[PDB]
Swiss-Prot record, chains A, B:
Phosphoserine PTM sites in chain numbering: E46
Oligomeric form and interacting partners: Homodimer.
Protein family per UniProt: Belongs to the DCK/DGK family.
Acyltransferase keyword on record: no
Swiss-Prot/TrEMBL catalytic activity: 2'-deoxycytidine + a ribonucleoside 5'-triphosphate = dCMP + a ribonucleoside 5'-diphosphate + H(+); 2'-deoxyadenosine + ATP = dAMP + ADP + H(+); 2'-deoxyguanosine + ATP = dGMP + ADP + H(+)
Source organism phylogeny: Eukaryota, Metazoa, Chordata, Craniata, Vertebrata
Biological-process GO terms, alphabetical: dAMP salvage; nucleoside phosphate biosynthetic process; pyrimidine nucleotide metabolic process
Function: Phosphorylates the deoxyribonucleosides deoxycytidine, deoxyguanosine and deoxyadenosine. Has broad substrate specificity, and does not display selectivity based on the chirality of the substrate. It is also an essential enzyme for the phosphorylation of numerous nucleoside analogs widely employed as antiviral and chemotherapeutic agents.
The entry's keywords: ATP-binding, Kinase, Nucleotide-binding, Nucleus, Phosphoprotein, Transferase
GO cellular component, one term: nucleoplasm
Protein name, entry field: Deoxycytidine kinase
C-alpha cells in the first residue's frame, strides 16, 4: 500500500532502540530504520567514518560538530530512503518506524551544539541552509511521531545500564537540556520549525520511566490504536 | 526542447567568467550558471555564509576546507537545478553553460585540499560519500565540457589583472598543481572518477593564453561547431 512513516523520538537512552527492536518483531508489515549515530556507537565506509567522527567529537566538539551533524543527517536520509524504496512492497498495512528523524537531528542535536558554541553562526546557518535544501531535494514526511518521554534521571540511569565507556561522563545537566527541547517540540508544541506540516502531525506520548522490556503490551496497544487513527 | 548542459572548466583566472558572460549575450537560447564561489568572491544568506567561509579558508584552510567544499558544491547543485527548472522553456536550441561543475569541485579543488592535508582522511571520505550520494539523489549530467586551457603563468598574470586582494598571495606552484589536475582530467583523460559516463562526454579544448575579450569570434565559432556535434 502507501507506507506509513512514524518517527520514534526521545532523549538519550530513553529506550528508543529497545522499543523499535520490540516493534519490528510484532508484524511482518512493520520495519524499522535504526539511527546511523546509534549504529556507529555499537567495516562499512559509513561506520568507519562515523566511528572516527564520534571519537573526534568527544575530543573536540567545537571542531567536529558541523561535520558530525551533516554526516549523521545525510546517513539518516540515505538509510530512510533505502528502507522506503526497498521494503514492505507486499505488505497490506505497511509501517516504517524511524529511530529519530531529520527534525531531531536539526532541532534537538545540531541546535544544542550551536547553543553550546560547538558550532559558530556560519556553521549553524550553513547547516540549516543545507538541511532546508537537502530535505526538499516529500518522500520522508512523517504520518506520526511517537514520543518516548523519560525523566533526565531515568535516561542517566539508562546510560549507566547500557555501559558505553564514552557516555559515562555525560552529565544530568546535558540530558536536562535535551529533555527541555523535546518537551518544547513534542509536548507544548512551542518550538517553531521550518516544516509547516509538522504542526499538524499527530504525536503519541508514551511514558517509558517504568522498565518495559518484559512488560510492553500496554505501550504496543497504544501504538496500534494511534496507527488506526492515521 | 531538452536543455544541453555544458560545463566551462579551467584553472583559476583562465577567463571562465569572462567567457561565460560573452556567451550569454550571443543567443536568447543561451543561459549561464555562474560558480557560487566566484559570486562569493565579488546580502543573500548564501553570500554572507560564502564570504565568511572564504575569509576563514584563507586564515586556516585545514579547519575550513571540508565546510567550504561541502557548501560550494551544495550551492552549485542548487543554482544549476534552479536554472535547469527555471530557464530556457521557450528556447528552440537551449544551452546552459555551467561555470565549472560538481566534478571540478571534487576532482580539482576538494582533491587538492586533501592532497595539501587541509582535509584529513575522514573529512575526505565523508566528502566523497556525500558527493557520490548528493549527485545521485541524472538531471545535471553534462552533454559536453569546454576546457579553457591557459598556462599557470597566464593564470598568475590574470589573478594580477583581476586584483582581488586575498588572491595576490596565491603562488605559481599552486596554479601549476591545479593545471596538472585539469590536464590529467580533460586532456590526457587519465584521471579516474566515480561517474562512468564522464569518460564518454565530449571535450572541446580552447587555448585562451591570448587575450580574447575584444577578439573571441574564433573561440565562439569552435563552441558553435562543438554544440552542433552534440
Ligand atoms: C550520547 C550523546 C552523544 N553526543 C551527541 N550525539 C549527537 C547526536 N546524536 C544523534 C543524532 C544526532 N544528530 N546527533 C550530537 S552530540 C555527544 C555529546 C557530547 C557532549 C556534549 C556536551 C557535554 C556537556 C559536558 N560538560 C558541559 C560543561 N560543564 C561545565 C561540564 C560538563 C557532554 C558531552 C560529546 C560528543 C558526542 C558525540
Ligand atoms: C582563488 C583560489 C581560492 N581558493 C580555493 N578555491 C577553491 C574552490 N574554488 C572553486 C570551487 C571549489 N570547489 N573550490 C578551493 S581553495 C583558496 C586557496 C587557498 C590557498 C591554498 C594553498 C596555497 C599555497 C600557498 N603556500 C603553500 C606552501 N608554500 C610553502 C607556501 C605557499 C595558497 C592559497 C586558500 C583559500 C582559498 C579560498
Ligand atoms: O525499559 C527499558 C528500556 C531500556 N533499558 C535499557 O536502557 C538502556 C538504553 O536503552 P536504548 O538503547 O533503547 O536507548 P535509546 O538511546 O535507543 O533511546 C539500554 O541498556 C536498555 O537495555 C531498560 O533496561 N529498560
Ligand atoms: O582574455 C582575457 C580573459 C581574462 N582577462 C582578465 O583575466 C582576469 C580573470 O578572468 P576571469 O575572471 O574570467 O577568470 P576565471 O577565474 O573566471 O577563469 C580578469 O581580470 C579578466 O578581465 C583578460 O584580461 N583577458
Ligand atoms: Na517486522
Ligand atoms: Na542569453
Amino acid at each position: 500500500t502507501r507506507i506509513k512513516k512514524i518517527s520514534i523520538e526521545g532523549n538519550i537512552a530513553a529506550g528508543k532502540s529497545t522499543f523499535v527492536n520490540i516493534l519490528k518483531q510484532l508484524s511482518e508489515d512493520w520495519e524499522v530504520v535504526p539511527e546511523p549515530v546509534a549504529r556507529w556507537s555499537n567495516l562499512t565506509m559509513e561506520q568507519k567514518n562515523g566511528g572516527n567522527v564520534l571519537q573526534m567529537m568527544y575530543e573536540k566538539p567545537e571542531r567536529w560538530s558541523f561535520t558530525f551533524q551533516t554526516y549523521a543527517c545525510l546517513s539518516r536520509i540515505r538509510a530512510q530512503l533505502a528502507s522506503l524504496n526497498g521494503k514492505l512492497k507486499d505488505a497490506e498495512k505497511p509501517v516504517l518506524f524511524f529511530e529519530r528523524s531529520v527534525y531531531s537531528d536539526r532541532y534537538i542535536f545540531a541546535s544544542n551544539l550551536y547553543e553550546s558554541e560547538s558550532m559558530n553562526e556560519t556553521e549553524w546557518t550553513i547547516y540549516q541552509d543545507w538541511h532546508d535544501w537537502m530535505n526538499n531535494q516529500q518522500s520522508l514526511e512523517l504520518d506520526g511521531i511517537i514520543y518516548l518521554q523519560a525523566t533526565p534521571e531515568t535516561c542517566l540511569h539508562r546510560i549507566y545500564l547500557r555501559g558505553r565507556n564514552e557516555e559515562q561522563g555525560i552529565p544530568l545537566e546535558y540530558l536536562e537540556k535535551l529533555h527541555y527541547k523535546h518537551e518544547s517540540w513534542l509536548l507544548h508544541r512551542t518550538l517553531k520549525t521550518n516544516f509547516d506540516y509538522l504542526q499538524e502531525v499527530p504525536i503519541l506520548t508514551l511514558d517509558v520511566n517504568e522498565d518495559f522490556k518484559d512488560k510492553y503490551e500496554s505501550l504496543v496497544e497504544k501504538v496500534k490504536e494511534f496507527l488506526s487513527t492515521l
